[PDB]
Structure formats: C-alpha cells, structure tokens
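Hello,

Following up on my earlier ticket. Below are the five sequence lines again, exactly as submitted.
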Amino acid sequence: ALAPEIVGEEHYQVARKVQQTLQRYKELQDIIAILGMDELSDEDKLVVHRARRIQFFLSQNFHVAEQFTGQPGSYVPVKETVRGFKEILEGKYDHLPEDAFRLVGRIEEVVEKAKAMGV
Amino acid sequence: ALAPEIVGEEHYQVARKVQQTLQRYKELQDIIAILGMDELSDEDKLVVHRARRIQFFLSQNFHVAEQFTGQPGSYVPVKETVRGFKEILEGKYDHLPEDAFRLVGRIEEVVEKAKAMGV
Amino acid sequence: ASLRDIKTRINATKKTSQITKAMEMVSTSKLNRAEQNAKSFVPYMEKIQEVVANVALGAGGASHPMLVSRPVKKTGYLVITSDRGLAGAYNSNVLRLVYQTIQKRHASPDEYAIIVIGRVGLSFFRKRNMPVILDITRLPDQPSFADIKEIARKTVGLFADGTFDELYMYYNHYVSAIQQEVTERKLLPLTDLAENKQRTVYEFEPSQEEILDVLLPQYAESLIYGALLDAKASEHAARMTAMKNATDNANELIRTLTLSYNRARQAAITQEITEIVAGANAL
Amino acid sequence: VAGTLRLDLAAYRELEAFAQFGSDLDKATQAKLARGARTVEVLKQDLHQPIPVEKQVLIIYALTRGFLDDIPVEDVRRFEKEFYLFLDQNGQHLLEHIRTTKDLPNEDDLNKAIEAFKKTFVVS
Amino acid sequence: VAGTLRLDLAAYRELEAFAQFGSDLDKATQAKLARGARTVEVLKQDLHQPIPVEKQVLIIYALTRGFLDDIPVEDVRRFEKEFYLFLDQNGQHLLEHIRTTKDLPNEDDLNKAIEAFKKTFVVS
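Thanks for your patience. The regenerated structure is below:
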C-alpha cells in the first residue's frame, strides 16, 4: 500500500526520505568504526545526526507494555507521525539530545522530555 | 613456455620488464587518486607514464570484431611486438598521447594515429 | 549475514587498510624530510634573537614593547591548520582553542583580527562568520620561506598603522611522534624577552631607535617561520599516527569478520553432509 | 551515446571507493565524481513511466556531452522532466529525424536546441 | 654459520613493510636492508644445479662475516659463481678440510683466502 496514489504524495516522499537516510547510516557503519567519526565529511555527519534521532523516534510506548514500565502508552495518528518525521527531516529539532526521542508518542512529547531534561 | 631457453633472452627480458612495470604501477593507482602523481618521486612518474601506454598497447583490434565496431583486424608477429614493447619501455614513444595506443596492431600504427590526431 | 556480503565487507576493508598504510608511509617520509629543515633553521633565528635582545630594549620603536597602542582596535591572530585531513581531531581542536578564547572575549565582530594558514582554515571559515584579511590556499611541504616572507611583511605592516594591537597565534608543537601540544603565545609587542648583552658596538652606525625599526620585523618573521615549520612537522606527526591507528583498527575488524566468516561456513558444510547422508539412508 | 556512458560509469565505480575521503582529492577525480553523480541521477526512473527511445537518446546525449555539468545534482530529475516538455513543444524535428532515420540529428541543431532550453531552465 | 643468516633473513621481512621510505636510519635501513637483500640474492638458485655442502658453507660464511658488505647487489650471483671457480682453482685444502672434519677451517686462513679472491674479482 506504499504508493503515491494510496497514501499521499507527502507521506510517500517522507517515507522514502527516511528510508534513504537510514540506508546511508547503515552504509557508513564500517568507516565510522574504523576511521572514526571525526574524518567524515560535513554531509555525512549531518546524515548520522538525523539518522540516529529518526531511529530513536521510530520507537514508541505501547498500551500493553505498561506491565513492564509505568509509562502509560499512546496512540499516534498518521497525520501526526508524518508531520513529526517531516519536521525532524527539515532539521528543526537538531538541537535536542538523542535520548529525548526514545519511547514517546507525538513530536510534542519529545520537547516535553527535553525540557524535563533541562535542554 | 616463458623460459629463457625457449622464447629467447631478449623476449624473456622484455616480458619480465613489462610484468614488473605493471606490478609496480598496481601499487600507485591508489596513492595517485588521493594525491596526484606530482607527490610521488620522479621515477614513479615515468613508471605511470609508461604503464598507461603499455596497458593500452596490450590491446588489439580483431578480425571478428568487425561485426561489433567496423575496424578491420590485424595480425602482429611476435618479433614485431617484442620490438614494439622494448621501444615503449625504453621511452622512444613517451611523447605520443596515450589514446594513440588503444586498439592498435603494429607499433607504426600508433605513430600513424598520432599523426592523424595532430600531435 | 551471508558469506557473499561478508566477502565484500572484508575486501573493502582490505582495500581501505592498504590506502591507510600507504598514506602512513608517505606521511612518515614527509616528516623525516621536514625534520631536517626544522633543525636547520635554528641558527638564523638565534642570531636575530640575540642581536634584537641586545639592541632593541631601551628605546621606543615600531615593534618595541608597546602598551595601549590604540587599545580598542583589532588584534592580530593566526590560525594554523593542516592543508589536508586524515590527521584526527587535531584540525578540529586547533580551531576550537582559538575560538573559545578570542571569539568569546572579543565582543564586536570587527574589533578582532584573524588570518589563517591552511587549506581547511577557509573551508571551515565558510561556516564561520569571521573576517579574514589574507590567507594561503596551499603551502608546499617544502620550507616555503620565500612564500611566507611577504605574508609576514603584511603581518608586521598591518600590525603597524595601529590596526593590530598585538600579534597572537595558536599552533601545535610536537614533543615526539605521539605528543603535540598547543601554543597560545604573544609575539610582536615583546611582552617576554631575555637579556643577551655582550656588545659595545654591533652594526650600530644608525641610532638605537632606527636599528630597532630596521631589525624587529625580521625578528617577527623569523619567529613566524619557526612556528610554521614546527606546525608543518606537527601535521606530519599527527597524520602519521592517525594512519597508524586507523590501520590497526581496520586489521582488528578484518580479524573479527574473517573469523566470523570461518565460523559460519562449517554450518553449511555440516548441513550438506547431513543432506547427503539422509538422501543415502532414505533409499 | 551509450559508448561514453559505459566508460563514465566504469570510472565512477572505481573512484567511488576513494570518494569516502571528502573533497581532499585531485581535481580530475572529483570532476569524474561529479560526472558520475549526474549519470546516476539521470538513470533514475519512477514507476510506470515508459519513455520514448528518442527522448532517452536525447537526454543521454545531453548528459554525456557535458551540457549538464553546471546543473546542481538535486535538479537533474526536474531538468529531465522539463526537457521532455520542451522537446514536445519545440524541436519536434529532432524527434522525427531520430524516429525515421534511427540516427542522431545534425550536431549543430541539437546543440542549439539544448542551449535554447538551458536559456529557459531556472535553477532552485 | 646458519644462525646469523637466519636472523638476517628474519629481520629483512618486517622492514620490507617500511619500503615506501628509503632512509630512516643507517643502522635500521642501510645495514639491515643491504645485508638482507644480499642474503636474498645468495639464497637464489638456478634450475637443476645443486652445489656441494662445503661450497655452501663457505659462501654462507662469506655472506655472514661481511665480505659482501662492499659488493653491489646486482653482482652477487656473479661473485658467487666466480668464487666457486676460484675455490676449485686454489682452495682445495679448505675444501678437503671441511669435507673430512665437518668443521669450519681456520678463520684467519679463510679470511685471507676470501680477501685474495676479492683482490681479483672485478665489479661491473
């Protein structure tokens, strides 16, 4: 069902861009391990920076997982997911720490967690 | 059959020199790309300069390649090709452009191509 | 992962390891060549040092000890960076140590002054919102005294006019192939000097202030040249150790991956043996 | 047109191994990298959009003769998309010539048409 | 005599990695690399030509003690061949002493014999 005429142009483009960034981060894993993060170019460092945050924001808190943790869980609409991933891709939230993106719902919860952390 | 007492001493020496030059050129392709040949020594510059021509002159046009390209083939005697490679190794044709050495038969045809291109 | 993918990863890491080892060798050669110039330059620096330490003091001149020489105005700084990369964090830190001090201390964007030596310097000052007076696109690894000579003349002459209050610099000096340390030292206003007098007359046909004006720019240029040679050799050492430890890391990864490939293949061997045995038995 | 394209892709595949070191490269090497990146962008194609062979040969000729060397890599797809509409509106004679004689049109006319199109293309 | 040659050949394998640069030290590069290259030259052998153990012992002694120190690498095989001929010409006493006792002859006599050969051998 991932086609432009089924899910929408914006959704399709955002999904493809996320997949491209994740694939590039996957490819960089040998040069990062060997030569170190310092010697990557300007664009590669930005790709890594966006990719780790995307990978963390893909995580979510589940309603049924409240037995393992006190976090109550959330239900995220497709519009919210698409807008949040678009905002991350446009570089809006590059000033937040990586750990703010783990196990949250909508994008506003990331800002809330970062402010709890002190940002 | 590549033995001094089988093919002759001149043949063996020429072939061994060609192999040594190509082997040495194999260790400079990587370095040249990152830093140009002007970084290397003066002798290695000549090594590359002659190895490119040797690589191109190892190629030949075939009679059966008519159906693919339209250029008629050639038959090169061993006594002619050894003399040609010896001359190229000793540098008699270092001044010609390297494109003149591609898909050519006898050595004189390289000079003919260089004349045609306006050396 | 599949054996096909493991083979490609191993081959690529071999090829990168070969590149890194070759560049380590080239950096080693350039270091061994630069050390000769670094040790040779010392006599000329020491001659000017002793003569200036003897004659310059006691008079006011162009580069005499100056204080409050147009205090609210630009101050000369130097940023020295490697022309190429692969040197590790050294290029990153030589920028940051200049930054956190002078950019923070100096409030107005105009009232400081920085010029750069190194290819990556301007490449990063594209990111930086910094005013650059003059710069070097590339310096040949040879000592390049003539090339940097006119630039040192520019530094002293634009120290003059009051535009630059003090010439300042940040560059790294190598103790050994493994140790390089950063400098934050003042040069022109001669805030530090040692007495060296043993002369009654030493080319003293002019006056004391005149000989000060004549001689001090060459002292400044000699110190700049020594700093530049030291920085070039530091760049060589940094790149050499970076290539060395990169090769070490690559060979470690190759050991791990190839051994992984070898543990994997025995499973395929036992699987095919099991299949042959079962096929023979079932009939 | 494909004779040069094969060689360009072959060179790009070789230098892609050294491309990991950034722009710290000899000038010809990143020139060839820039050519290869545009080649890869040109060869990209979306779903269920067949292209006529004349338009394929024209865009490949434009890429391989160097006419695209000044367009940014991010604009190659849009450049090709607009080039097809430009060829539909004007230059139908080149398409008809290729379609009938199976050979390239006159070299001068094709170069003039490509330059005329680039005079109308607008960069991002 | 075998131990010193074993050490020299073992040493001239790791230093071959440091071949891209020529002159690090006189001790590390000059002496080690020269002696190793001469060892590699002497250990080379032609086809279907075995040589006796006593001649092998003498040439290995000459290599190890340093009589090849001032001989160019390219002339080492000719030096070895003419050395065997000179031994056949004059050193039958040393040859028979080795062949009977399985022990090295008098070192000073061996030194003077090799010096007498080097007196006549021509480098070209």
